[PDB]
Design a protein around this ligand. Structure first.
Ligand code: NA
Length: 310
């Protein structure tokens, strides 16, 4: 009664092993989550194609994942790949070669598919209401999801990822370069949402949610800026809330710092390279939709994959 799902991201891949409960009430219990530091982001060439060293790291990850699942009695791993392989021009070729080498097929899912599954992961992590808007900021893309208590009704994927924006708007040496990038990213967010007014905008009673790593880091940083302990000592950030004003203040702080300093802001360790652009995406998007406050969900794509499998 054990199931395994995995996602291939940009710099990390994760295997989730869960026990599937009696179908009557159903549900799942997470047995293990195993990370692989695939680091595909540093294995992308100038045209964005995955290098042979990237194929090797990916093949190595999926081989180890397959063994972990099999030794745990979980049978076969469903594997979905997101922005890294989606945007690589040779992503489909890499996926078929990895399948030939490992027997696992990393299916490259669309941004919208990722968003609809992530919404399921959020559903089982935090309490959804009758009108929810979810923003899931990844490396290449930002997914907007709207729905009710059960599933996504509307999904939009826009090319506003933390890595993609960091690259699209290179930061200069000047003291104002962080602010200038933040402003340019915000103008790009509004421009790509311009065809889509009303779709994800706050209505009375709309509740807003965030998922994935930037948002979790933001919640950790904001809580510690209110005097809290690091999330690692407080059991994580799932369910934490923060206001748009708190996000704006964290962004203004980050923008006046240089990249190396950003990685020393508590909560933002391991995200100094993209946190400026990523916070700029989140604030600009939330502001444009009229969000006042958000809840952060540690559940996301992998949990959603489980829910669909069950
Ligand atoms: Na995303």
């Amino acid at each position: 009664m054990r199931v395994a799902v995995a996602d291939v991201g940009t710099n990390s891949s994760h295997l989730l092993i869960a026990e599937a409960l009696p179908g009557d009430a159903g549900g799942f219990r997470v047995i293990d989550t195993l990370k692989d530091r695939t680091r595909l982001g540093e294995c992308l060439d100038t045209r964005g194609e995955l290098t042979p060293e990237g194929e090797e790291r990916l093949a190595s990850a999926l081989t180890r994942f397959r063994e972990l699942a099999a030794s745990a009695g979980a049978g076969d791993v469903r594997v979905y790949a997101t922005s890294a392989l989606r945007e690589a021009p040779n992503g489909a070729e890499v996926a078929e070669r990895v399948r030939q080498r490992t027997g696992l097929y990393p299916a490259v899912i669309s941004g919208v598919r990722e968003g609809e599954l992530t919404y399921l992961g959020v559903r089982e992590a935090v309490e959804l209401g009758p009108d929810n808007v979810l923003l899931d900021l990844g490396g290449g893309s930002l997914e907007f999801v709207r729905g009710a208590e059960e599933r996504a009704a509307d999904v939009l994927s826009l090319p506003l990822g933390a890595i993609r924006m960091t690259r699209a708007f290179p930061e200069g040496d000047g003291k104002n370069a962080g602010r200038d990038v933040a402003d340019a990213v915000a103008r790009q967010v509004r421009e790509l949402l311009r065809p889509h007014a009303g779709r994800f905008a706050a209505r009375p009673g709309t509740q807003f949610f965030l998922s994935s790593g930037t948002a979790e880091a933001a919640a950790d940083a904001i809580a510690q800026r209110r005097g809290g302990r690091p999330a690692e000592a407080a059991g994580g950030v799932n369910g934490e809330r923060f206001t748009l004003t708190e996000l704006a203040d964290l962004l203004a702080h980050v923008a006046r710092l240089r990249p190396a300093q950003r990685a020393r802001v508590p909560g933002l360790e391991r995200r100094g390279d993209t946190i400026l652009a990523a916070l700029s995406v989140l604030h600009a998007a939330l502001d444009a939709l009229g969000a006042r406050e958000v809840t952060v969900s540690e559940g996301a794509l992998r949990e959603g994959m489980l829910i669909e499998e069950l």
